Ligand binder design. Sequence first.
Ligand SMILES: [Ca+2]
Ligand SMILES: [Ca+2]
Lengths: 63, 486, 706, 659, 101
Amino acid sequence: KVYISLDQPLTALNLFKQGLDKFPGEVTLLCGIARIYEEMNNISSATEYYKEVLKQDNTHVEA
Amino acid sequence: SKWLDSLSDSMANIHTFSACLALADFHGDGEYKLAMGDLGPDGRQPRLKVLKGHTLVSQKPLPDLPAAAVTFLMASHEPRTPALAIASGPCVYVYKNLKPYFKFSLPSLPRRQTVITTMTTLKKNLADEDAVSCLVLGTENKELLVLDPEAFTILAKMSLPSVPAFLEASGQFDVEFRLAAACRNGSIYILRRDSKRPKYCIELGAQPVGLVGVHKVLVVGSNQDSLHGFTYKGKRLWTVQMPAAILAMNLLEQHSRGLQAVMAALANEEVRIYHDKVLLNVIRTPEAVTSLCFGRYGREDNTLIMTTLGGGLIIKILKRTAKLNVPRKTRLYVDQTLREREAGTAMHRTFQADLYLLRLRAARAYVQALESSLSPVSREPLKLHAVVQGLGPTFKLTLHLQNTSTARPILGLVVCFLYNEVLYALPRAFFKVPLLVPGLNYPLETFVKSLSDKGISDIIKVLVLREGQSTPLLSAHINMPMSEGL
Amino acid sequence: DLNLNRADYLQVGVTSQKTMKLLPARATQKVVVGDHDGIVMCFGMKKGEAVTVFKTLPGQKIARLELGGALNTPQEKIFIAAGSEIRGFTKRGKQFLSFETNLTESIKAMHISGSDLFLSASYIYNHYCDCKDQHYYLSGDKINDVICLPVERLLREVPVLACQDRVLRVLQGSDVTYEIEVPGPPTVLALHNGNGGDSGEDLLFGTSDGKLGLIQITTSKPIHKWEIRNEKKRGGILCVDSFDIVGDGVKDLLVGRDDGMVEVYGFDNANEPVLRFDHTLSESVTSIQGGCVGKDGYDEIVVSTYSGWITGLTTEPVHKESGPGNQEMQNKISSLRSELEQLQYKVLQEREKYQQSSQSSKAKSAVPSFSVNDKFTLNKDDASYSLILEVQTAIDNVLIQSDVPIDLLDVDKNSAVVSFSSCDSESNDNFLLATYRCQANTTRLELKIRSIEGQYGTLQAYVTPRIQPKTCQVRQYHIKPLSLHQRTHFIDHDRPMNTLTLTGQFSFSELHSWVVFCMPEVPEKPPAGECVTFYFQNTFLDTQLESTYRKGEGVFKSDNISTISILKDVLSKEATKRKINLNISYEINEVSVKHTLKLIHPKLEYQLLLAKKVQLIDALKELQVHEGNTNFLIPEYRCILEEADHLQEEYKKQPAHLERLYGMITDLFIDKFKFKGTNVKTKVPLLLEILDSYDQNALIAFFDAA
Amino acid sequence: LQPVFTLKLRHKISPRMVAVGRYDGTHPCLAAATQAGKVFIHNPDVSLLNINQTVSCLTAGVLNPELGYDALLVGTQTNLLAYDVYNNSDLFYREVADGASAIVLGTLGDITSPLAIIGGNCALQGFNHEGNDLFWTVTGDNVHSLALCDFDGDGKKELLVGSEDFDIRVFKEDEIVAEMSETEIITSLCPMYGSRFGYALSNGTVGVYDKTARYWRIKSKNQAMSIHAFDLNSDGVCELITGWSNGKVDARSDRTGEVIFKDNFSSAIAGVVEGDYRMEGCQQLICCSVDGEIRGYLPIRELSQKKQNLLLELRNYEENAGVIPANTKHHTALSVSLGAHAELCISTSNDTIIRAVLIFAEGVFAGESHVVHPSVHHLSSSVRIPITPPKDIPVDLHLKTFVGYRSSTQFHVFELTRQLPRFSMYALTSPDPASEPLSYVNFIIAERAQRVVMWLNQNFLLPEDTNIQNAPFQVCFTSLRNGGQLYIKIKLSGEITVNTDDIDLAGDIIQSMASFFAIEDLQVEADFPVYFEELRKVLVKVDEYHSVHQKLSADMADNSNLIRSLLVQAEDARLMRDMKTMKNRYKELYDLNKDLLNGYKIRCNNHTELLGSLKAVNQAIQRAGHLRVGKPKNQVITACRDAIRSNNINMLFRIMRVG
Amino acid sequence: ILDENAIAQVPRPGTSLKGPSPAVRPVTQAGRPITGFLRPSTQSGRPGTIEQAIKTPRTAYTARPIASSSGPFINLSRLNLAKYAQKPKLAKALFEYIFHH
Ligand SMILES: [Ca+2]
Ligand SMILES: [Ca+2]
């Protein structure tokens, strides 16, 4: 949130991938990555990350 | 890489045109200078500047803005430099050796004089490098004055239907002269012997931005970013399309290879030399170019000097050694089509039943709306919608009302607001509306004000109704937002 | 557009003004120069090296050198005037004329018109004809140069006499016909062609403030044709000449300066001049000529430099040949190498002998004397003297000791460092002790000095050159009491004059000595007639100080109370010094204070507006960097956003002007109350507060009331 | 030469804040500070970056060698930010709280990661590509310039620190190597040679240093803003490019400082930096003015005048074979007077007089000179000059005594060099044990009490009558910048007791005596009660200041949010033409602004006091470590920092008490 | 609008937050096609000026209408937070109360 407030998507994405390196399959982190990719409007990666969320949750209302 | 570059400068503020810039011999001894009547950096200060080599040698103020500047030999007695006849106002300053030598005046009109805009020369009998040339002036009054060799008397007066803008003189004046005039009305008129009136006109469809005469074809540059080659009889023979606008067209003629091709100074930062139909020797420039000249500048028979739209000079010396996105269907689609093929009858029947029930419920809701008259769009033509603007305790509520009819005004109408008198304080909750003229959106605004100290959002109704009736003609609703009070 | 390459020639000793000439000789001419030791020499510069000719014997300091000829013959006789006599050489080492012309002090200018000889002096002017006195004049002011119009193209000889007080007295015989007025004290003047002007006669003058002109002296009145009054080209014209270097067909004007600047003026407008090429030289030009001296076939300018470097500016390129890889650089390098080796040998052995012989008891160590061409002028556009020291060698350090509160400002052209040593003002009488070390190899040093309307006193300056014994020479300038009064020729009597009369027991010479002690620009020698009137003018603000005086009486009218108060105090001090017991009687126009305050008001208004705008300049600049200033900034501050630069650069100098104005106002107040017999040295702080407020009407109210 | 390119940038460039960096990886661009706290980037169009804060440093380099992009660094007096301009993303945004007065970017000794060194109040720091503190040490005063140069030739570069104390120290990864004492606040260092570095001051002095000596030096006006070593002549050896305060760019030589190339501008010179704009594979030299014009470059008779000067000297000597007996000798004498200055008397064993004296010393006198100059009624043979140096550094006066008679217009100038020792002050007196100071530092020396007498006699202006050899050896000096004392006592075992209540003075004495007796390492036993308790009280005030700042910051943030909301509400009222509520919103805004300005004054005073307290803590660390020579120094520093991060104040003081 | 925190003013297209064409997918602004799963953190574009943000629908840039800026159990002015801070068991729940309630 802090990094998105300072308009720094590519810092937030690196931080999210660091977190996923810590927590290997977290759903909120993958969903945040997908939200950032959709705000930047490149859906071809937001669909991939929502599909990862699905592979983890499969009931996720957002993805 | 046929165009050997010589000089590229950007501090030279030379805002001339392709017609008020001419190079010729000015002190004999085979050293050609280039005289140009340059405007101000904006167009305020007319200054005549001549160029020898690539350093400025003399710039001197001029009375008014030069409309053209062309050189010519006045007589063959011990041929010195040609005379530079620079056109300014109703006057022609004839310079001999770049010195004020004569001031020809235009014969006035019954005072209402005129101004000269276009000026070229015409050959008398010889048409060689030593021949005598006569001026041809285009007055602002639609007239062409064929002058004398020494710029003091008139040899001919030709009548044109519109103010000329560009001129081309072909042949020898006495026996075979052809005068092509590109006017402001977007037309080329040709003048031949015995014809005081052209009677051979050609329309371009767009105003001609240039005019260069090839020995047989006459090119006309259009405002539609193209060239059109016509014949001297009044019949187009070809047309070529340009990728961008045409700023200035001049003539590139070298007699060694007999190449007489028209140029083109396009607005896309390039210049392409055009023969009859083919492109060749296209060049590039750091900025789009407004004027080009090709001649024997300095001591080279193949010099081309070009001035950028922003100023500066670029001089180039020509070397003598010239599959579809059809979608995909997955297992879901074939299973769905199999279900449809095996159970199509039940789907058809149940969808028809659902459509019947939907028509029933839609008619029900339409009748209920007609009863309550809640449609903001409803013989008796009207259309109203209410917009709310502003946070804070005071909101601006503007009703956009409109009469939607061919031609019939609505005289007696009135608007009445319905609100909760404990939450909103409307000053005038009822007011007449102006005479609604068919086709105009009338914004009729009011100031709603929230009174509740706690945030309470309550609806506000608006009823538009006649003054002799009691049933609202139409209505609208607005959910007032939260107050954000104090 | 013109380019001149700096080619150096032989170096001679230190030269005075207009001490170089060119023998007319189509090939290369010959250069002739005169050193301050009397060694007049001439060379031809055949090929790179100076082929010296008749380098004569040392004598007195050559004050002037001029070549002329009796008849219309090509002028070749070169006449010098060293100490008090005029010697004359032919175009070789044969002296033929030696006119003793027994005088008192020296010669400062001379002109040779065939046989006619017009020489100047400190004040005296003589016109001889072959060692026979024929005309004698004694001006009231020192003469700078003398010329006679062409006695051939015209008929009568009309010698012009340029005085120090900004006048050109065009006299005939032994009495002035009329006097032409010129801005600034004239220093050089020469008819502006090889003949003296096509249209009859024309005189071209150049003044010490930096100004050129073409006074056309007719039979009874002058006809001013143009003037080259400059702004950035300050510097005393020491030399001027006419020669066609541009090659257009009309002769150009080659003019020198005092700050090295050499300028060529072309007449391309066919009647008026225009600058074409300027070049700085790091020393003071003393003579300029045209023609050619090296590699005949290319016109060049010969410039005599103060220290003696006879330089040329040629129109011919220097690097005329090259390849894959000049040699004259190597030749000159090798020559200087060898010379410096052998000179180092000799001077090291002599230093050893001198240091070992310095221990001799009875022996005395003599000192190398040298020359310092100083110029203590007064800038008129400002209120600051501009002192300018020059030495033939380079300087090491310059002391500036004072006895007056003085501001040493900064000069961008100066490259020295400054070192304001901590004065005391209680035990030493030095209210100022500066010290300008000069970096690298600089000869001249220009430094500003700003003194208040009062505080008279001396000012010393110790100069030390970069020579081996490293001696020092002291100079004593004077900051006069009324050091801001530039003398002019006319006043306006319709101003409120606060007259003042001194009476009693004067020798007119002594009263004149008092006025010289009291005023910047007045001749020392008492003017003849026992009755003299001078028309001064304050430069900080225009207030005249007409001063008239006879053998025993003096009237010092004025437009300022401060001026007459200072005069009263200083003259009473001089009287008490010399045991006179004079009698003062003053008078006041009760509106003069109003006039002076109305004069001051615009300056204080401008200073306060300066401060008010520069306070907000930077705050507005912080807003400027955003949103591009398209729609929001008020037009009021938009008028400041453009001129921010000039406002900021004037704010740097503002505080000095504000302090000076406050001091002047408080002195005006104190003095105008002192004349009535009161002592109001106590009400000053209220006046200071009022000026912090500066209600001009409340200011005049406080002036009239208390 | 000729400027290979020129351009005009409309933004005022801050002087010492300029860098060239390939922010696109392969496309070099210019980064430069500007007014309002914005950093602009010129790509070959100008792009702004809102630092929204007054910048004080700026560089650009490779911070993570894994990728080939330059990282734009931006320092502020309370922050430090690395920035990947290409993919806009903070590499690290660290908060220093010590300030950013001078930063560099390179590889230190025995560190495998390019550090972003920084310099603040009195402490340096270091950060890797993520922002982890890997280097930290304390220095004398405010750091003004830093550069990386391999003094000592061992392949790992030590860093050169220019302290506001006028000193230039060289720091290894942990150890201090050497310190040369310049004469003014350093402003710029630049290395491009092996062990040679070019330095600038605020006098205007631009010079060059070998290991521990100056090749050349030139002092002028218009003190240099930015120095940078480049190879303008392409002779293979770099030269000192310099940009002065007037506009002059003079490329000099690293040999005897002879001007080789010269150029001029319209305003001052912000920065000279090398970087290949035109993509030619070879470095360039860009000069950037203060007013925002950039220009980029690609890489005779005076000796005859000297001959003439030699001939003039020969003329003088031949004239010989305002006059003065040739055997006139100027003899000086130093002394010290209490009733408070070091007096220097100059005389002449003749009847001649001393008309004026112009002493020239670098850092003692204000300016470079102190001309004495008696009045004509006061002239005599012997003249005394009082001197009051500001600090204890041995200075060398170059006296120039103007010798001549009374009424003379020209007279000699005798030159003479006299060195005021390090401790020129502290006149010797009689010890009064009632006024004995309690603060003392103790340590042991090698041997040779006679050599201690030598040290004391060569670093102090002791009178002639002093005779002290071995056993008691108690000398009591009284300071002259204060009333304090200085007790040097020596016992038989070789133990030196220094009883100075001042700690900087004891540090100076210990370091000088160590450098004198050729000592590498040493440990002390120091007690400074009245100073240690003051430092303790400062440490106590620190956290209170922190809390107050946090409270005021939260309050001002709340009020700023209120003001933003009120600006929006006022805009809405103005757009609906409700003038009464608009005036109400503006009254509310006026009141909030007045409250916020009051809070701003309070917070600013508190922040100034807190910065003073932090600099006091760091100066305490540096004065504790400074009291020990060699390795026993470094330890303390480390321990001291490790004693602050844990708030173990008593153990902290024990580290600075015994070590 | 009134709060600027992004360092870069005009960063490269693709590194800042500030598919199917509008001929298929409905839109909300010039771009920004309609999304699934409205969350209260959605900005979905941003206005240029305060006037544009006011003179538009209140819920065109957020899931909720935009604001101007984003008895009682215990009276906050009565308790000494310096004493509840000593007891973390009380301090944690008390902070959660003060912050979220
Ligand atoms: Ca090393
Ligand atoms: Ca080099």
